[PDB]
C-alpha cells in the first residue's frame, strides 16, 4: 500500500492527500451533479498522516481549508501537484 511519509513531495509546505484518482468514490447515487461543482476544483481527499497507509493515490496540495466547512478537509485545489 502507499505509505505516506513526511518526504512524499517535500517542495513547499505541501499537505499530502490520499484519494482514489481513477474517478471518485461517490457513494449512494442520488441528486448529484454530473459535473464537479466548485469555484476552483472539487477535490475530495484526506490529509496523509505520516507513517499511515492509504490504499489510494497520494498527492500534495497547498490550500487553506475551513474546519467548520465540511466533514472532511476538502481541497481548494489551488496549488495541487499529482
- The owner of cell 499511515 is 52
Tell me the backbone φ, ψ of residue 53, rounded to 5 degrees: -110, 120
For 16, the 3-state DSSP assignment is strand
Asked whether the CA dihedral 22, 26, 29, 30 is positive or negative, the reply is negative
Helix (H) or strand (E) holding 44: strand 43-44
Experimentally, the structure was elucidated by: NMR
Within its chain, how far is the Cα of 30 from the centroid? Answer: 22
**What domains sit in the chain, N to C, each tagged with a CATH number?**
1-82 (3.20.120.10)
Asked whether the CA dihedral 12, 14, 16, 20 is positive or negative, the reply is negative
C-beta separation of 48 from 18 below 8 A: yes
CA 3 to CA 64: how far, in whole Å? 24
Amino acid at each position: 500500500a502507499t505509505t505516506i511519509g513526511p518526504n512524499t513531495c517535500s517542495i513547499d509546505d505541501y499537505k499530502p492527500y490520499c484519494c482514489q484518482s481513477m474517478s471518485g468514490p461517490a457513494g449512494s447515487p442520488g441528486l448529484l451533479n454530473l459535473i464537479p461543482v466548485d469555484l476552483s476544483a472539487s477535490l475530495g481527499c484526506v490529509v496523509g498522516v505520516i507513517g499511515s497507509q492509504c490504499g489510494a493515490s497520494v498527492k500534495c496540495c497547498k490550500d487553506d481549508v475551513t474546519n467548520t466547512g465540511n466533514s472532511f478537509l476538502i481541497i481548494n485545489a489551488a496549488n495541487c501537484v499529482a
